[PDB]
């Protein structure tokens, strides 16, 4: 149910400074985390500028729903040549009450977000990774189903899916062997090589890991009230160019 | 001046 | 129809120039080689000289066969009837290009008359805004002007709705 | 069809013909510049470079080709050259109001 | 509320319905006039939004003060690096050729006109975006944003410009040719554009030798064989090269402004080029601009080496076309004779009793020759001659046959009374040419000063 939607940022503004001025437009006060993460913490992902600040801004006058609950969530690093994106859930329009305040006051401009193929893939990946308390990782299978939706002459082929369970993801990535990123490094190729299909050219629409997300073209549901943060680090890494 | 035609003659020796 | 074959010839004569200028780009240096047996190392004006001996070799040849089909205007060749149009394509498309590039120059040297007349304006403007005076509590005109705002609204609705005869521009 | 299927055939023929001729050419590059088994290269003389310089369907293929080249290579370039003034011309008229609204600006 | 307008008016008035569906400061975004703008001058101040005011009737319609905002800022705050539109113009920009931006069709118009002007800005996108990094991810964009802007640029340092620019321009030439597809043709393009601004560097008194070195550094380019193969003509090449020509036949007839004799002459390099093909368009280029080069000349002693060569090309230019003594020459465009007669050899002429003298003759020279069939039929129009000219090509003994079974009333009348021999054939064919109808009239007109029977028929 918890839906977002993401905007880029043009500067690295220190949201913490100018906080009171947003309270008094706002009318309320507004909670402000600051959060220093390591995320791509993999070998080959990098040892080395992982070092993303995450700021957590609420507009809760209540949490009884998503447009009261609604977070927004900050996400730079000052490596980065855009350095810093947004992201906003629910359909409260204090949102765009906020949003006007920062391109008002730091004259910074900013404009909404789209994903490719390869990057849901590459989401859709992080998101069902999970790391433990002992600093190793871990992966938990859900019942992917790809959903596509071409265009061809006199609507000869509207939409087709390939609906994956959990137990041939599994056995897929154990195949393959001890991987990282199932859905690149094994499911697609054997889903090309058993059809001739190629997953990434073809036009994806969604990509629903059952029961626990929706990655859609403009927006990321979410079954948990939050986003783990290697998708918010994916979300960054596609900001770019 | 002439390393211009010394690289215009390097592009027409590539030529 | 004939046109089919007509084109695999219009593909196969590019192929077949491109082809004959690399042979004489082999023969020539092949020649030069002959001579000596390591020159390889002709020198750029050498080569262009070169290369404009071949293009004078163009210039021969074409006309060579341009005399034998037109010395003879006999059209008993297909090819040559269809020779005759792609000859005159040729020249008659070059007016049209000759005039734009001449009219071109014109209309950029507008734009530059214009660009020169707009760095004048931006110099004045900048003199004169640096002569001027810096731009410079408002509480109670604030409140004064919600005061505006309720009365005259109100009676933006209230005459409106009273039926009244004459609505005007309350203020 | 048998002038185009003649003239194809012989084409195609000289064709071969070239293909051979460019095959043994190159085959005599190879081996020559193995006679030239330094890197170096001899300065091509001019006397040798005069002599080159004094001995020397095939020209229906040249006409051909440089003909219709010259023509839509030409509707290119007027074509994209006229594409290029009516909008910088746009351009220049809007440049023109923005000068002439803020000339009187300057003089406001 | 004007008459031609209305449809566009009431487009807008229906537009603005589809669309819907289908303190003692002041804001700037608050003012509705030019007159009110300047009433408030001291109290105005510019909202810190710069994407509004970049982008987008009886009432006021803001959209015609955001034509000036963007001047007005440029006013009020001194144009400088800190200026807010320099930042969006180059955000933007960066979008585009990133392809993040949802349409650059859209933002490109608006960054190509505010660059043409702030040549502080519009260096700065040079220096950012002219280079072959960026070809590699759009050329189209590339060759569309730097010919809008770059034919209006003025470089604010001479030293290195031209090596920058040498070095970017050898680039592309190579990426053209790394590609081998004429389409490719972004080469001839820029080429065309960056001559349209060394007109501005000639007019400029200074930077002028920098154009001139410029402007020959690149000549270079678009006369090498492959770009321009008399065999592979693309047009491209041969209209880039008679424009960047041209901007000398302007060049010498703005010599009131002096210049040295190098980078005035063309040279032989190129003309023995240009000469050895046959595009009739570059030909009238080529005397069109020795014509201007003849302007020139007397200014200088005849025993000058670069005096000496133009007399070269002018002697073998006439010997070539109409003088027909071709043979007797020591060389034809730097090529002895000898080959001629060989060359001929195996090379079938239906009437091999004249092999050489067709080729000496515009009437013969191929694309001159067709062009010279074009001008003996109106002239045989004009003429109204009820003989006609059996042969297509012209030459000797296509000209001498028909009037051998004619010769018995061709006395009398029945064909071109202003005729009697081949010379006199070719010299009417000039005749035509000796007015302003051709576009080709140049290569008579300009080789009629030497040849003194010529100038007498003119």
């Given at each position: 149910?918890?839906?977002?939607?993401?905007?880029?940022?043009?500067?690295?503004?220190?949201?913490?400074?100018?906080?009171?001025?947003?309270?008094?437009?706002?009318?309320?006060?507004?909670?402000?985390?600051?959060?220093?993460?390591?995320?791509?913490?993999?070998?080959?992902?990098?040892?080395?500028?992982?070092?993303?600040?995450?700021?957590?801004?609420?507009?809760?006058?209540?949490?009884?729903?998503?447009?009261?609950?609604?977070?927004?969530?900050?996400?730079?690093?000052?490596?980065?040549?855009?350095?810093?994106?947004?992201?906003?859930?629910?359909?409260?329009?204090?949102?765009?009450?906020?949003?006007?305040?920062?391109?008002?006051?730091?004259?910074?401009?900013?404009?909404?977000?789209?994903?490719?193929?390869?990057?849901?893939?590459?989401?859709?990946?992080?998101?069902?990774?999970?790391?433990?308390?002992?600093?190793?990782?871990?992966?938990?299978?859900?019942?992917?189903?790809?959903?596509?939706?071409?265009?061809?002459?006199?609507?000869?082929?509207?939409?087709?899916?390939?609906?994956?369970?959990?137990?041939?993801?599994?056995?897929?990535?154990?195949?393959?062997?001890?991987?990282?990123?199932?859905?690149?490094?094994?499911?697609?190729?054997?889903?090309?090589?058993?059809?001739?299909?190629?997953?990434?050219?073809?036009?994806?629409?969604?990509?629903?890991?059952?029961?626990?997300?929706?990655?859609?073209?403009?927006?990321?549901?979410?079954?948990?009230?939050?986003?783990?943060?290697?998708?918010?680090?994916?979300?960054?890494?596609?900001?770019?160019? | 001046?002439?390393?211009?035609?010394?690289?215009?003659?390097?592009?027409?020796?590539?030529? | 129809?004939?046109?089919?074959?007509?084109?695999?010839?219009?593909?196969?004569?590019?192929?077949?120039?491109?082809?004959?200028?690399?042979?004489?780009?082999?023969?020539?240096?092949?020649?030069?080689?002959?001579?000596?047996?390591?020159?390889?190392?002709?020198?750029?004006?050498?080569?262009?000289?070169?290369?404009?001996?071949?293009?004078?070799?163009?210039?021969?040849?074409?006309?060579?066969?341009?005399?034998?089909?037109?010395?003879?205007?006999?059209?008993?060749?297909?090819?040559?009837?269809?020779?005759?149009?792609?000859?005159?394509?040729?020249?008659?498309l070059d007016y049209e290009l000759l005039q734009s590039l001449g009219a071109q120059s014109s209309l950029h040297k507008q734009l530059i008359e214009s660009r020169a007349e707009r760095d004048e304006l931006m110099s004045k403007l900048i003199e004169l805004s640096?002569?001027?005076?810096?731009?410079?509590?408002?509480?109670?005109?604030?409140?004064?002007?919600?005061?505006?705002?309720?009365?005259?609204?109100?009676?933006?609705?209230?005459?409106?709705?009273?039926?009244?005869?004459?609505?005007?521009?309350?203020? | 069809?048998?002038?185009?299927?003649?003239?194809?055939?012989?084409?195609?023929?000289?064709?071969?013909?070239?293909?051979?001729?460019?095959?043994?050419?190159?085959?005599?590059?190879?081996?020559?510049?193995?006679?030239?088994?330094?890197?170096?290269?001899?300065?091509?003389?001019?006397?040798?470079?005069?002599?080159?310089?004094?001995?020397?369907?095939?020209?229906?293929?040249?006409?051909?080709?440089?003909?219709?080249?010259?023509?839509?290579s030409s509707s290119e370039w007027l074509s994209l050259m006229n594409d290029q003034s009516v909008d910088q011309k746009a351009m220049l008229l809007l440049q023109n109001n923005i000068n002439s609204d803020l000339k009187e600006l300057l003089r406001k | 509320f004007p008459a031609d307008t209305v449809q566009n008016t009431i487009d807008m008035?229906?537009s603005?319905?589809?669309?819907?569906?289908?303190?003692?400061?002041?804001?700037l975004w608050?003012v509705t006039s030019l007159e009110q703008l300047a009433?408030?001058?001291?109290?105005?101040?510019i909202?810190?939004?710069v994407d509004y005011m970049m982008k987008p009737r009886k009432?006021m319609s803001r959209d015609s003060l955001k034509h000036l905002y963007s001047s007005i800022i440029l006013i009020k705050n001194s144009r400088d690096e800190?200026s807010s539109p320099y930042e969006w113009c180059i955000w933007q920009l960066k979008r585009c050729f990133?392809?993040?931006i949802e349409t650059p069709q859209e933002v490109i118009p608006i960054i190509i006109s505010v660059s043409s002007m702030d040549n502080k800005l519009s260096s700065r996108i040079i220096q950012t975006f002219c280079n072959?990094?960026y070809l590699?991810?759009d050329e189209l964009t590339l060759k569309k944003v730097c010919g809008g802007i770059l034919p209006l640029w003025k470089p604010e340092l001479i030293?290195?410009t031209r090596?920058f620019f040498?070095?970017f321009m050898?680039?592309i030439?190579?990426?053209?040719?790394?590609?081998?597809?004429?389409?490719?043709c972004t080469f001839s393009e820029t080429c065309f554009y960056v001559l349209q601004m060394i007109t501005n560097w000639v007019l400029d008194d200074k930077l002028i030798?920098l154009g001139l070195?410029l402007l020959?550094?690149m000549q270079?380019?678009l006369?090498?064989?492959?770009?321009?193969?008399?065999?592979?003509?693309?047009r491209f090449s041969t209209m880039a090269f008679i424009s960047s020509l041209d901007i000398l036949t302007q060049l010498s007839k703005q010599?009131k402004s002096?210049?040295?004799?190098?980078?005035?002459?063309?040279?032989?390099?190129?003309?023995?080029?240009?000469?050895?093909?046959?595009?009739?368009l570059?030909?009238?280029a080529?005397?069109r601009?020795?014509?201007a080069?003849?302007?020139?000349?007397?200014?200088?002693?005849?025993?000058?080496?670069?005096?000496?060569?133009?007399?070269?090309?002018?002697?073998?230019?006439?010997?070539?076309?109409?003088?027909?003594?071709?043979?007797?020459?020591?060389?034809?465009?730097?090529?002895?004779?000898?080959?001629?007669?060989?060359?001929?050899?195996?090379?079938?002429?239906?009437?091999?009793?004249?092999?050489?003298?067709?080729?000496?003759?515009?009437?013969?020279?191929?694309?001159?020759?067709?062009?010279?069939?074009?001008?003996?039929?109106?002239?045989?129009?004009?003429?109204?001659?009820?003989?006609?000219?059996?042969?297509?090509?012209?030459?000797?003994?296509?000209?001498?046959?028909?009037?051998?079974?004619?010769?018995?009333?061709?006395?009398?009348?029945?064909?071109?009374?202003?005729?009697?021999?081949?010379?006199?054939?070719?010299?009417?064919?000039?005749?035509?040419?000796?007015?302003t109808?051709?576009p080709?009239?140049?290569?008579?007109?300009?080789?009629?000063?030497?040849?003194?029977?010529?100038?007498?028929?003119?």
């Amino acid at each position: 149910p918890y839906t977002w939607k993401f905007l880029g940022i043009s500067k690295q503004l220190s949201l913490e400074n100018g906080i009171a001025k947003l309270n008094q437009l706002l009318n309320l006060e507004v909670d402000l985390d600051i959060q220093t993460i390591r995320v791509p913490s993999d070998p080959d992902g990098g040892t080395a500028a992982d070092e993303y600040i995450r700021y957590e801004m609420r507009l809760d006058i209540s949490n009884l729903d998503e447009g009261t609950y609604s977070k927004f969530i900050f996400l730079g690093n000052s490596k980065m040549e855009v350095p810093m994106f947004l992201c906003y859930c629910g359909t409260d329009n204090r949102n765009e009450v906020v949003l006007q305040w920062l391109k008002a006051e730091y004259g910074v401009i900013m404009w909404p977000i789209k994903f490719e193929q390869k990057t849901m893939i590459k989401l859709a990946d992080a998101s069902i990774v999970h790391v433990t308390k002992e600093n190793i990782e871990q992966i938990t299978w859900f019942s992917s189903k790809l959903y596509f939706e071409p265009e061809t002459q006199d609507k000869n082929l509207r939409q087709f899916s390939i609906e994956i369970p959990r137990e041939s993801c599994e056995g897929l990535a154990l195949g393959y062997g001890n991987t990282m990123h199932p859905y690149n490094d094994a499911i697609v190729p054997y889903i090309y090589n058993e059809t001739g299909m190629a997953v990434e050219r073809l036009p994806l629409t969604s990509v629903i890991l059952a029961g626990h997300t929706k990655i859609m073209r403009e927006s990321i549901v979410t079954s948990t009230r939050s986003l783990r943060n290697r998708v918010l680090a994916v979300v960054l890494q596609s900001i770019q160019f | 001046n002439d390393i211009t035609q010394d690289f215009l003659n390097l592009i027409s020796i590539s030529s | 129809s004939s046109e089919k074959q007509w084109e695999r010839i219009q593909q196969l004569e590019k192929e077949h120039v491109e082809v004959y200028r690399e042979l004489l780009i082999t023969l020539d240096r092949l020649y030069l080689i002959r001579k000596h047996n390591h020159a390889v190392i002709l020198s750029h004006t050498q080569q262009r000289l070169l290369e404009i001996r071949h293009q004078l070799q163009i210039n021969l040849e074409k006309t060579a066969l341009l005399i034998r089909l037109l010395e003879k205007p006999d059209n008993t060749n297909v090819l040559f009837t269809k020779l005759q149009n792609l000859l005159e394509e040729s020249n008659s498309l070059d007016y049209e290009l000759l005039q734009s590039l001449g009219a071109q120059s014109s209309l950029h040297k507008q734009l530059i008359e214009s660009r020169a007349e707009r760095d004048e304006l931006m110099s004045k403007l900048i003199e004169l805004s640096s002569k001027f005076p810096k731009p410079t509590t408002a509480g109670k005109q604030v409140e004064v002007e919600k005061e505006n705002e309720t009365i005259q609204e109100l009676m933006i609705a209230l005459q409106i709705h009273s039926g009244y005869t004459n609505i005007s521009y309350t203020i | 069809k048998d002038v185009l299927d003649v003239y194809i055939k012989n084409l195609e023929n000289q064709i071969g013909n070239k293909r051979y001729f460019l095959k043994q050419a190159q085959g005599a590059i190879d081996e020559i510049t193995k006679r030239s088994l330094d890197t170096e290269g001899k300065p091509v003389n001019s006397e040798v470079f005069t002599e080159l310089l004094r001995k020397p369907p095939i020209g229906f293929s040249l006409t051909s080709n440089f003909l219709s080249l010259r023509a839509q290579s030409s509707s290119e370039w007027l074509s994209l050259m006229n594409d290029q003034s009516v909008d910088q011309k746009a351009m220049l008229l809007l440049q023109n109001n923005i000068n002439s609204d803020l000339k009187e600006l300057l003089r406001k | 509320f004007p008459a031609d307008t209305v449809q566009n008016t009431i487009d807008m008035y229906l537009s603005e319905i589809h669309q819907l569906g289908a303190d003692s400061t002041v804001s700037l975004w608050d003012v509705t006039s030019l007159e009110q703008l300047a009433q408030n001058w001291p109290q105005l101040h510019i909202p810190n939004d710069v994407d509004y005011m970049m982008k987008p009737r009886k009432v006021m319609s803001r959209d015609s003060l955001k034509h000036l905002y963007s001047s007005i800022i440029l006013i009020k705050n001194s144009r400088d690096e800190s200026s807010s539109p320099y930042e969006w113009c180059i955000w933007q920009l960066k979008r585009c050729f990133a392809h993040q931006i949802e349409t650059p069709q859209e933002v490109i118009p608006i960054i190509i006109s505010v660059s043409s002007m702030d040549n502080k800005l519009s260096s700065r996108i040079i220096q950012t975006f002219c280079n072959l990094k960026y070809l590699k991810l759009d050329e189209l964009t590339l060759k569309k944003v730097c010919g809008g802007i770059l034919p209006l640029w003025k470089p604010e340092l001479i030293s290195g410009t031209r090596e920058f620019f040498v070095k970017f321009m050898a680039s592309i030439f190579m990426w053209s040719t790394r590609d081998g597809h004429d389409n490719n043709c972004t080469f001839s393009e820029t080429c065309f554009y960056v001559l349209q601004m060394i007109t501005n560097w000639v007019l400029d008194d200074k930077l002028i030798a920098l154009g001139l070195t410029l402007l020959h550094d690149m000549q270079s380019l678009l006369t090498l064989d492959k770009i321009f193969n008399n065999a592979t003509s693309n047009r491209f090449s041969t209209m880039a090269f008679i424009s960047s020509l041209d901007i000398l036949t302007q060049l010498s007839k703005q010599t009131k402004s002096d210049y040295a004799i190098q980078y005035l002459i063309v040279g032989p390099d190129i003309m023995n080029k240009v000469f050895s093909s046959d595009d009739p368009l570059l030909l009238s280029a080529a005397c069109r601009y020795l014509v201007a080069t003849k302007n020139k000349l007397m200014q200088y002693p005849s025993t000058n080496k670069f005096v000496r060569m133009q007399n070269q090309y002018i002697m073998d230019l006439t010997n070539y076309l109409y003088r027909n003594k071709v043979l007797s020459s020591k060389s034809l465009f730097g090529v002895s004779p000898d080959f001629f007669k060989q060359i001929l050899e195996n090379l079938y002429i239906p009437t091999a009793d004249f092999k050489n003298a067709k080729f000496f003759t515009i009437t013969g020279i191929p694309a001159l020759s067709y062009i010279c069939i074009i001008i003996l039929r109106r002239l045989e129009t004009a003429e109204n001659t009820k003989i006609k000219f059996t042969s297509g090509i012209i030459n000797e003994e296509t000209f001498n046959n028909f009037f051998r079974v004619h010769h018995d009333e061709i006395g009398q009348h029945g064909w071109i009374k202003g005729v009697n021999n081949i010379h006199d054939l070719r010299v009417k064919i000039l005749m035509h040419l000796s007015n302003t109808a051709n576009p080709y009239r140049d290569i008579a007109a300009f080789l009629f000063t030497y040849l003194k029977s010529l100038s007498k028929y003119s």
